[PDB]
Amino acid sequence: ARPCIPKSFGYSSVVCVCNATYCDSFPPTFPALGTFSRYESTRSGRRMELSMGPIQANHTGTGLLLTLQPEQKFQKVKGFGGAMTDAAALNILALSPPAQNLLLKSYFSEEGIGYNIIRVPMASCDFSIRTYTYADTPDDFQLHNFSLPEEDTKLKIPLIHRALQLAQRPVSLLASPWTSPTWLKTNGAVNGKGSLKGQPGDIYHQTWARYFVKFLDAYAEHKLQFWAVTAENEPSAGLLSGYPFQCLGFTPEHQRDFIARDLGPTLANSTHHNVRLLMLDDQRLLLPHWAKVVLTDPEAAKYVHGIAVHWYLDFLAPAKATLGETHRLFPNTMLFASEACVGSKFWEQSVRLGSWDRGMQYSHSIITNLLYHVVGWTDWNLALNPEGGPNWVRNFVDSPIIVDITKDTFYKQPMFYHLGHFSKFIPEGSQRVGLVASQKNDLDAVALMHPDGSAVVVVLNRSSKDVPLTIKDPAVGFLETISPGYSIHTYLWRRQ
Ligand SMILES: *[C@@H]1O[C@H](CO)[C@@H](O[C@@H]2O[C@H](CO)[C@@H](O[C@@H]3O[C@H](CO)[C@@H](O)[C@H](O)[C@@H]3O)[C@H](O)[C@H]2NC(C)=O)[C@H](O)[C@H]1NC(C)=O
Ligand SMILES: *[C@@H]1O[C@H](CO)[C@@H](O)[C@H](O)[C@H]1NC(C)=O
Ligand SMILES: [Mg+2]
Ligand SMILES: [Mg+2]
Ligand SMILES: [Mg+2]
Ligand SMILES: [Mg+2]
Ligand SMILES: [Mg+2]
Ligand SMILES: [Mg+2]
Ligand SMILES: [Mg+2]
Ligand SMILES: [Mg+2]
């Protein structure tokens, strides 16, 4: 294992500096029964530092106790990852090959944080430098002129293969479109207010559904298979006049009927029938309404595997009214967080190198999502430049890895480590279990059990105050620990 090379840029914490010959690295340590592992990251600069401690048979005192309830079972976890946008691919490929491989290993290798999801845009988005679709030849309803351009064949696809080949965990791919070809749209433009022409069940909608199959066919020719697709990225965006970049507007009723008549049946009657379909792929305030509109129509519901949710400017929001209510109404339709990013005010710089606050936003969001039944959490761009780009409409945002081309260097932000406290230690098939606090407290925490029956607990302290605490597992005993102010911990232990 190789330690963080820390660097401050004046924010509250440090980045870890990587280059062609060096990057910080680690696989999770399950010590002997009766011992626990602790991984600690701190604002002061500790980065996922491993320590161990004893598990006692007994505990006495008045301090905070967190008690696992391993017989209280909740959702199974699909996983964690990020988005291979054109911008992410361009930034990674701007490094020398050895630096590229250390960046990819940081995310995708067991030496890194064990990502197992990659979100793949279907053609261009704001994090593109060229506006294109896969079928720009006008009025090509047959999709004879459907093809993948070099953004896919020379940048994204080869990087996806490289990422998958570094992983031991199976990696799941998720596809989402931003716009259709403009000749399928009411406004004839990639951006602005515009929807598919006509109505679900017609030639425009059947062509758009077929475009999904042609996309999956084309990636399958490149030996890539998808776990899932979403029905549209941010369908509410295309309802807005002046929307600045690629979009395709659907009301929830339009999405319902498109799924029922066109996309569901077209996918089901294809070689890609095992690919899951996720609805919504948009902000939380649209729930539970969107779920009610789509999932109460049995001819739409039969095709919808899950509900994809985005996080933006609401990482510290309460989720009971949106995620909680949606789970209560539709508990057998999984919730999955398909996109999250930190945005700045329109006049502010998008990237804050070394912001601990942005790290805490990521981990607080992941904990909140897990406590409201969400099965996975997906970051946005895997890497950006120090401006938060490139981006053809200057809609810059932050990313967990920032590439500086001019020094063949990349910077791992606090967000990287906050996500890794979950991704590295919560394999696919892990299950959230109960965790109860003895007294009111300022901590954020979640407990899960691995498929093999091991325990994992994440404890985030967004306060400035150190909090001594005890964790009880009724089968092994008590972990006496401390949660320092501005820390995040992941605890691991064997239960037998
Ligand atoms: C990439 O990052 C690594 C880690 O921060 C940098 O590693 C450093 O590499 C230099 C190589 O010149 C090492 O310097 C050595 O200094 C001694 C003492 O003067 C000298 O006798 C040696 O010949 C050599 O120059 C340095 O110790 C090493 N540090 C670590 C922690 O491994 C590397 O420089 C970075 N690459 C670039 C291009 O900045
Ligand atoms: C579209 O595909 C057809 C059939 O292969 C081909 O004849 C035509 O040249 C293509 N059109 C364009 C504009 O590429
Ligand atoms: Mg600290
Ligand atoms: Mg308790
Ligand atoms: Mg897959
Ligand atoms: Mg408009
Ligand atoms: Mg495919
Ligand atoms: Mg409007
Ligand atoms: Mg978005
Ligand atoms: Mg981003």
Numbering used by the authors: 1 to 26, 28 to 497
Text taken from the publication that reported this structure:
Retention of anomeric configuration is achieved through the Koshland double-displacement mechanism using two key carboxylate-containing residues; in the case of human GBA, Glu340 serves as the catalytic nucleophile and Glu235 acts as the general acid/base. Inherited deficiencies in GBA activity cause an accumulation of GlcCer within lysosomes, subsequently leading to the most common lysosomal storage disorder, Gaucher disease. Here, the production of active crystallizable GBA in insect cells using a baculovirus expression system is reported, providing a nonclinical source of recombinant GBA with comparable activity and biophysical properties to ERT preparations.
Consequently, our GBA was studied by X-ray crystallography to generate a 0.98 Å resolution unliganded structure in a novel crystal form. During initial screening, crystals were also found under condition A5 [0.2 M magnesium formate, 20%(w/v) PEG 3350] of the JCSG-plus screen. Previously, GBA has been crystallized in space groups C2221 and P21; however, this unliganded structure crystallized in space group P1. Overall, the three-domain tertiary structure is highly similar to that of the BTP complex and Cerezyme, with Cα r.m.s.d.s of 0.49 Å (Q score of 0.94) and 0.60 Å (Q score of 0.94), respectively. The sub-Ångström resolution of this unliganded structure permits the first ever atomic resolution analysis of GBA, uncovering finer details in its structure. In fact, many alternative side-chain conformations could be modelled throughout the structure, providing more detail on side-chain mobility and interactions. Multiple alternative residue conformations were observed throughout the structure, including two conformations of the catalytic acid/base residue.
